[PDB]
Amino acid sequence: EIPPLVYQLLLLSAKGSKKTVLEGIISFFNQLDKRQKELDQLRHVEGTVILHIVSAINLDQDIGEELIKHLKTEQQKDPGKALCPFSVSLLLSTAVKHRLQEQIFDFLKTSITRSCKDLQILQASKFLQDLCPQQYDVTAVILEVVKNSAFGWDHVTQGLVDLGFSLMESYEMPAQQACKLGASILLETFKVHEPIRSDILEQVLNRVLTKAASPVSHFIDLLSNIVVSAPLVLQNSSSRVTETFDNLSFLPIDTVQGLLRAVQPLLKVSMSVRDSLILVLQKAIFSRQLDARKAAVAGFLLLLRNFKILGNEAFCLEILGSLRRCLSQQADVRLMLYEGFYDVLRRNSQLASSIMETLLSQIKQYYLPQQDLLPPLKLEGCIMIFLQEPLAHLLCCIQHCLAWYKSTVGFEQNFEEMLESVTRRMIKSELEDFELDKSADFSPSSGVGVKNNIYAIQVMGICEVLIEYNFKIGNFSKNKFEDVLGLFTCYNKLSEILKEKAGKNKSTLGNRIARSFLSMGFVSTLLTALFRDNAQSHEESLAVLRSSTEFMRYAVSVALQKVQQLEEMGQTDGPDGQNPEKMFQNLCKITRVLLWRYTSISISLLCLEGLLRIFNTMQQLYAARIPQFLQALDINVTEKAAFQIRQFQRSLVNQLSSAEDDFNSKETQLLITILSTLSKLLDPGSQQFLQFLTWTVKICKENALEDLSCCKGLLTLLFSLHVLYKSPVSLLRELAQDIHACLGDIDQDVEIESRSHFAIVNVKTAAPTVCLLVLGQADKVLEEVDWLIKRLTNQTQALEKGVILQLGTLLTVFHELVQTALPAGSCVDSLLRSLSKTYAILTSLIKHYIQAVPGRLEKLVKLSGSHLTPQCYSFITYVQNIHSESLSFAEETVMAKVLRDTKPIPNLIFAIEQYEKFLIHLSKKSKVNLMQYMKLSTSRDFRINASMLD
Amino acid sequence: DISLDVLTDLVILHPSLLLRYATFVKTILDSMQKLNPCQIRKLFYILSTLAFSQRQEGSYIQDDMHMVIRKWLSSSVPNHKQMGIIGAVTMMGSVALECDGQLSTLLDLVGFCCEQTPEVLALYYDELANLIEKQKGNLDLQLLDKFGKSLVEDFPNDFVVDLSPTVDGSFLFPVKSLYNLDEDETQGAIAINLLPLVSVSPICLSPCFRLLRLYTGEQNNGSLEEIDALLGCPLYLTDLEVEGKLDSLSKQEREFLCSLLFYALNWFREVVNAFCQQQDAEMKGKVLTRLQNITELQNVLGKCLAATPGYVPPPALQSYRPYFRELDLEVFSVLHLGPAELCFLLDDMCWKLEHVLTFSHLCQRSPKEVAVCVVKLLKPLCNHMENMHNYFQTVNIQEYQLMSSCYHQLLLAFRLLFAWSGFSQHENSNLLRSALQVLADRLKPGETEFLPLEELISESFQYLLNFQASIPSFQCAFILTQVLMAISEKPMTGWKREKMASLAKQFLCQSWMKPGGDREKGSHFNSALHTLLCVYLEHTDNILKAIEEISSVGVPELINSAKDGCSSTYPTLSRQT
DNA sequence: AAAAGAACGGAACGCCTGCTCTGAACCTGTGCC
């Protein structure tokens, strides 16, 4: 009924007109889908009609050319509208026609990029949402399209897969959003479009090995998702399991590990794949070079856990020695097996014995047993220039494997004796016993120096491992603690004075020390014993440990490096480091002692860093796991978060109210940053949001953060809350009064009262300390204004009223600064940079309205002429005096400085007249004389003083 | 256009390789309703003749094309319907390098579909004329006869008028044999009954004489045998002075007489086309008389064309230029003397020069052929040029303005000839040297004998500089100095730059006024003076010195002395200018 | 009269510097050492 009728209508349009009939039938389908949403026969009818229309368009491609222009015009008019499922389905269907699909794809990419940018802008500023509630999301409609076209359509699946293939490459922030959208639509169409599953898998496998140089992390992510959704898809896609290893050992950036983990079920259900990878293993491990041999050993280590350890065992008995055959390799290559052996050790018993025996042989290769003699560690073995046998990682692997072996239940007797002897040997030794006796022994860029430098790096790394092992052995054992405490005395003996070598760079690598070697569980437990570990069960070993003040400092400093490793990278060293759920529990336990120790009342300054980094991690890593932490912090998310702020506000006000003698500005800066980092996740409409604002403005307007970063840091905080809630132009106007009261006016003949509305700003804070930040907001305030003005290019009356209020109020602000004597730094430059920017935004709204008189606009112009222009030009005359006086400091080739010091001045004039020239254009076209309020554009001349040259 | 042009080479190299996808290609071409007429010709050229060429398996495309034209020759979509007959012309052209059956079937279908269509025999005959004009040379005599022998049935049956003086009927005006036959009583029957033909399509007759010229060009060397008694035909129209009563017309006969005249001058163009090149008994003389007749007829037309407020004449001053027989240069066999006739002839050639060197007939040849066409008879050009020079040495306003305009138009011709950017390409530098050889031999006693390029440059420079003495209008001075730039090198040498400075300063110091006073200050005058000043100041020796002298002597004298006139040292400079 | 035409009037993304914030052990001065 409907399909033949609309086919006849399309034939009529081919004979007649197509400008409006197309849009009419899109609208008909749109309301049909809307009424049917709250229909399989209707969906089949829709499939038939789209098939008919796409065949007709393919027959006459030029007929559909008007669709591109029509949709572009609609998108220019409608802010994100007209991108209905019908329209996008028609667009993708003709893309399969292969005619002009590139331009359609480019238009789609531009539209989605604009859509995600607009979504981010609206999310990051509610002030635009109130005046622009037309939040149109292309992602929502395109993801609903998957379900809409999941009823056996002619070419919807092909269009969607082509769209996703273009999307994934377009992704390469907006790029991350595009990649996420493409991956989601591919997953949805794989879970929906059954008959294209094999073709999709083959195509993505062809693409998966398509960017060797470029990152393909999104590719492996999507492949893993589709494989875990359909485990047997690649089984039906056979003859590719062998093929996928063509150039796998070229660029391991964790891509190889991800590929192996994604395909692991296939290997465990596909013996041919296992055999082929075994065959490739011989070539990979025997590669004489070391450029890419790391990927091979990493993949083999992962495979060891990939295959089950139930108990053919002959498979394992064969593959045990494969990696050991490459043990004599480069130190960097030898590194990864030590870190990775523990993971596979929890999957077998006999394999554990074999690995322990091999590691025993390796450690005995360097042990050098003796009694009451030189340090057993033959540090000179790895001296040569470079090193080929890391020791700290090996010892950490030794202790972890020993712990797991003991827990699961003579090499183990040899292990404990060797561990006990070397620990006893270390305490029964000193720097004199080691090769490094004197402080002036080794120097950087010296053959003896770098050798001793490597030795120093190794030995203190060894000390950390023995610290961890004895703690597990010494369950409330004072003798083991005495060995532990004495061992640390050797550790810092190398440090402090001869730390690393010396390191004159005033930098603190790894929080304070090089990369630690402590399992996260141990350091978590050590602090709990070290802090809050009060009980009669302890034998004063904690107390003497507490006596070692440097042990306190080192106790948390390692964890601070550890969390920073998890802060930047998504993983960390130590057992269970890359397991997030295991790490999350560790993250829950550690934070309590760090916070409590600070509240006990330097050392506490460390805990401030530790907390500030732990929040910044989980808010950026454990997005879904926040409720678990909040439950462990002890859906009232805002209640407890505000409670912690209250405990922190008391410390700050007490510190801020105290005299400058006891200031510790480093803590105060941290006290402010933690507020900002903890203010990110308050309730958007919470009362505590308003309550926190009411307190901070009181403190800012009352207290005087004379410290540089303290004033800057606190002012940064208040705006982050005062952006998503309101506009700050009232505050900026108020602050502009104080700086105007702080100094003298440009006119040099007018005085002002104290008018100290805010105590944060004072005479000593007249620097860019404040007048650069507020101008940054002035940059942001105008930055978002352009977005709506561009959109502005029924409620438009409200749109124009709001802009003229913010711009008009901001216009008064600039008038206040422009009469003051701004500091001669870059703040003079930046003021002229935004002043040039401000006039430009004044244009595009007027430039828009040309294509459309109100007196409200005139009153803004009247205020603009009266309070801005003559002052600005007079302010320009001020700059001449300032630069001339400032240029006297020329050590008592100034060509470079003079040009820069006056570079914004010409472009200030040009931005004045380009607005003026179009404002001239408006006046004639608008039939109104707007120039009576304003003033003739003044200009300046010069004169060379010939007499002064003598 | 480039895609079709390369497709020509692709089908030429491997016809089977192209016709492999030729099914889809032809389906797309037929389906695509949007196609430029030139693109229509390009596609149909092979789309209609692939079967005749590739006789093995090409019959499918030919059958599809014949079916679609049969459904569209009588179809209700005249827009692009003539594309079918265009493809027919392409088919005969391919056959004009058996197949007669397909052409006969197509012609029968066209005739059936155009039984009563007015613009059917018109456009069909236009297509045949284009055929033989462009690519009909290799056409067999039998094929050409079968295509276009309907002249013996159409022309003498109802379009060949009778020479008897008994013409009478319900005509708006009486029939008078304007421009009667030169040979009285030799062939009385030689006349054309125009008024009976209008009141048998008057629109259709104008593009016919071309076709009989084309027939006699293949059935004989010349047109004398077929049109011996018809070359000197008069026109059956009202009295020539009858146009004087334009007010007396009042559309009672004004429109009818306007159509009469409009068909008349186009018929004169047709006969001058068909019976010009051949030399026979008074053939070239009668051609000259026809030229004088058409000039006088157009002059008479001008009056009623101004009197007629609006018109929509059928194409088969300058505003009516599109609705005219755009006669090519093939008529110029007697180029080597009515000054008005010269003005009109070189006005006809000037527009073509401005278009091709900067509407199907002039576009049919490349500029390489334009060069040979223009150099075919450069000798009469220089002869008339020196005649006008001698007249100006001797020096009626009604004649003086005529010579002035002819002068200007001739210099326009040489400037748009030699300022051609195609001379930058050296693909025909020998042709340029040969073209300049006649001018070089005209300056010197002659016998260039492979003259040197620099010698030719200097000789042509001096020869064209000879005209720098006497010049009637400033626009002529502009075009003279610009053609003098055009022949010489782009960057002038020192001697030529000094000559440029001297001549341009002399022209600046010259005084220009129309024959009846009335200084020639106008609009084109402004651009002409702009170009003069640009080239002079560019080619001066001391540019700063020259501008200082101008702004320090010429302007002050104008501001001080001149009230409504020019400046004393620079009569070209004016307050308005 | 103040209308076109197209030659005149005009716009966007890309670039690494000459930039200023940041950096660093110092060397000075003076109550302490």
Quick check: B32 contacting A, CB < 8 Å?
A: yes
Residue indicated by tokens 């003698």:
A661
Residues in chain A: 950
Backbone angles phi, psi at B237, to 5 degrees: -145, 180
Instruction: Check if the beta carbon of residue B295 is closer than 8 Å to that of residue B344.
Output: yes
A252-255 CB contacts, 8 Å cutoff, 24+ apart: A252/A292, A252/A294, A252/A295, A252/A298, A253/A215, A253/A217, A254/A217, A255/A216, A255/A217, A255/A220
Nearest C-alpha neighbor of B417 from the set B477, B487, B517: B487
Calculate ∠ Cα A38-A43-A48, nearest 5°: 155
Give the burial string for B92-117 (b: 16+ CB within 10 Å, else e). bbbbbeebeebbeebbebbeebbeeb
Instruction: Check if the beta carbon of residue A611 is closer than 8 Å to that of residue A651.
Output: no
Nearest C-alpha neighbor of B497 from the set B509, B514, B511, B485: B485
Residue A314, H or E segment: helix A313-324
Q: Which residues make beta-bridge pairs with A418?
A: none
Q: Rounded CA gap, B409 and B476, in Å? A: 8
Q: Rounded CA gap, A45 and A579, in Å? A: 51
Give CA B66 to chain center in angstroms.
Answer: 36
User: For residue A62, which residues of chain B lie inside 8 Å, CB to CB?
Assistant: 32, 34
Q: Round and report the angstrom distance from CA (A272) to C1' (C16).
A: 53
Quick check: B34 contacting A, CB < 8 Å?
A: yes
When computed from its CA atoms, the radius of gyration of chain B, rounded to whole angstroms, is 28
Q: Rounded CA gap, A283 and A272, in Å? A: 17
Q: Residue A635: CB partners within 8 Å, gap ≥ 6?
A: A627
Q: DSSP 3-state assignment of A931?
A: coil
Q: What is B519-537 written as a DSSP string?
A: ---SSHHHHHHHHHHHHHH
Instruction: Extract the tokens encoding A547.
Output: 């006596």
Phi/psi zone of residue A125: left (φ > 0), alpha (ψ -120 to 50 degrees), beta?
Answer: beta
User: Which amino acid is residue B191, in one-letter code?
Assistant: A
Mutation to test the B interface, candidates A11, A18, A62, most B Cβ within 10 Å:
A62
Residue indicated by tokens 């000390």:
A463
B213, with CB counted inside 10 A (0-12, 13-18, 19+), is: buried
Q: DSSP 3-state assignment of B511?
A: coil
Instruction: Check if the beta carbon of residue A563 is closer than 8 Å to that of residue A617.
Output: yes
Q: Rounded CA gap, B567 and B574, in Å? A: 7
Instruction: Check if the beta carbon of residue A249 is closer than 8 Å to that of residue A207.
Output: no
Residues B34, A59: C-beta atoms closer than 8 Å: no
Give CA B442 to chain center in angstroms.
Answer: 28
Quick check: B36 contacting A, CB < 8 Å?
A: no
User: For residue B34, which residues of chain A lie inside 8 Å, CB to CB?
Assistant: 62
Give the burial string for B393-417 (b: 16+ CB within 10 Å, else e). eeeeeeeeebbbbbbbbbbbbbbbb
User: Which amino acid is residue A708, in one-letter code?
Assistant: L
Q: Rounded CA gap, A112 and A118, in Å? A: 10
Residue B374, H or E segment: helix B367-375
- Taking the C1' atom of every nucleotide in all shown strands and the CA of A826, the nearest one is C20
Q: DSSP 3-state assignment of A492?
A: helix
Q: Round and report the angstrom distance from CA (B206) to C1' (C6).
A: 37
- Taking the C1' atom of every nucleotide in all shown strands and the CA of A914, the nearest one is C10
Backbone angles phi, psi at A517, to 5 degrees: -140, 30
Instruction: Check if the beta carbon of residue A739 is closer than 8 Å to that of residue A766.
Output: yes
Q: DSSP 3-state assignment of A936?
A: coil
Q: Residue B451: CB partners within 8 Å, gap ≥ 6?
A: B437, B440, B459
Q: Rounded CA gap, B567 and B572, in Å? A: 8
Residues A62, B31: C-beta atoms closer than 8 Å: no
Q: How many helices (H) and strands (E) does chain A have?
A: 42, 0
Residues in chain B: 577
Instruction: Extract the tokens encoding A257.
Output: 């590990």
Instruction: Check if the beta carbon of residue B118 is closer than 8 Å to that of residue B77.
Output: no
Instruction: Check if the beta carbon of residue A875 is closer than 8 Å to that of residue A815.
Output: no
Q: Residue A3: CB partners within 8 Å, gap ≥ 6?
A: A45, A48, A49, A52
Q: DSSP 3-state assignment of B282?
A: coil
| 3-class SS letters over A324-381 | HCCCCCCHHHHHHHHHHHHHHHCCCCHHHHHHHHHHHHHHHHHHCCCCCCCCCCCHHH
Q: Residue B538: CB partners within 8 Å, gap ≥ 6?
A: none
Residue indicated by tokens 């430098």:
A453
Q: Which residues make beta-bridge pairs with B176?
A: B237
User: Which amino acid is residue B219, in one-letter code?
Assistant: Q
Q: Rounded CA gap, B109 and B219, in Å? A: 27
Q: Rounded CA gap, B327 and B349, in Å? A: 9
Nearest C-alpha neighbor of B300 from the set B344, B342, B258: B258
Q: Which residues make beta-bridge pairs with A86?
A: none
Instruction: Check if the beta carbon of residue A786 is closer than 8 Å to that of residue A735.
Output: no
Q: Rounded CA gap, A834 and A563, in Å? A: 40
Q: Rounded CA gap, A476 and A321, in Å? A: 40
User: For residue A59, which residues of chain B lie inside 8 Å, CB to CB?
Assistant: 31
Instruction: Check if the beta carbon of residue A752 is closer than 8 Å to that of residue A745.
Output: yes
Q: Rounded CA gap, A203 and B231, in Å? A: 78
Nearest C-alpha neighbor of B474 from the set B531, B391, B516: B531
Q: Which residues make beta-bridge pairs with B237?
A: B176
- Taking the C1' atom of every nucleotide in all shown strands and the CA of A901, the nearest one is C19
When computed from its CA atoms, the radius of gyration of chain A, rounded to whole angstroms, is 35
Instruction: Extract the tokens encoding A317.
Output: 């008995």
DSSP E strand stretches across B135-276: 176-178, 235-237
Q: DSSP 3-state assignment of A537?
A: coil
Q: Round and report the angstrom distance from CA (A252) to C1' (C15).
A: 33
- CA of A78: how far to CAs of A125, A138, A669, B16, B272, in Å? 21, 13, 47, 52, 65
Backbone angles phi, psi at B356, to 5 degrees: -70, -30
Q: DSSP 3-state assignment of B178?
A: strand
Q: Rounded CA gap, A466 and A415, in Å? A: 13
Q: Rounded CA gap, B249 and A785, in Å? A: 72
A 10 A CB-CB count for B538 gives 13
Instruction: Check if the beta carbon of residue A305 is closer than 8 Å to that of residue A347.
Output: yes
Q: Rounded CA gap, A420 and A371, in Å? A: 12
Backbone angles phi, psi at B176, to 5 degrees: -125, 130
Instruction: Extract the tokens encoding A324.
Output: 């050991």
Q: Rounded CA gap, A129 and A133, in Å? A: 5
Q: DSSP 3-state assignment of B514?
A: strand
Q: Rounded CA gap, A937 and B501, in Å? A: 44
Q: Rounded CA gap, B208 and A474, in Å? A: 121
Nearest C-alpha neighbor of A168 from the set A123, A112, A115, A121: A112
Residue indicated by tokens 């223009």:
B374
Provide the 8-state DSSP code for A574.
Answer: S
Chain breaks in chain B (C to N over 2.5 A) after: 97, 199, 316, 336, 358, 395
Instruction: Check if the beta carbon of residue A201 is closer than 8 Å to that of residue A226.
Output: yes
- CA of B538: how far to CAs of A482, B528, B548, in Å? 100, 15, 14
**Which protein residues have their Cβ less than 7 angstroms from some atom of strand C?**
A 504-507, 768, 825-826, 896-897, 899-900
Instruction: Extract the tokens encoding A737.
Output: 């009064």
Nearest C-alpha neighbor of A640 from the set A685, A686, A702: A686
CB proximity under 8 Å: A 41-80 to B: 59-60, 62
Calculate ∠ Cα B531-B534-B540, nearest 5°: 135
Provide the 8-state DSSP code for A745.
Answer: B
Instruction: Check if the beta carbon of residue B238 is closer than 8 Å to that of residue B297.
Output: no
Instruction: Extract the tokens encoding B4.
Output: 């079709």
Find the residue in A nearest to B35 (Cα).
A62
Instruction: Check if the beta carbon of residue B284 is closer than 8 Å to that of residue B337.
Output: no
Nucleotides of C under 7 A from a protein CB: 18-21, 23-25
Q: Are strands B176-178 and B235-237 parallel, antiparallel or unpaired?
A: antiparallel
- CA of A920: how far to CAs of A837, A869, A929, A930, A932, in Å? 20, 16, 9, 8, 12
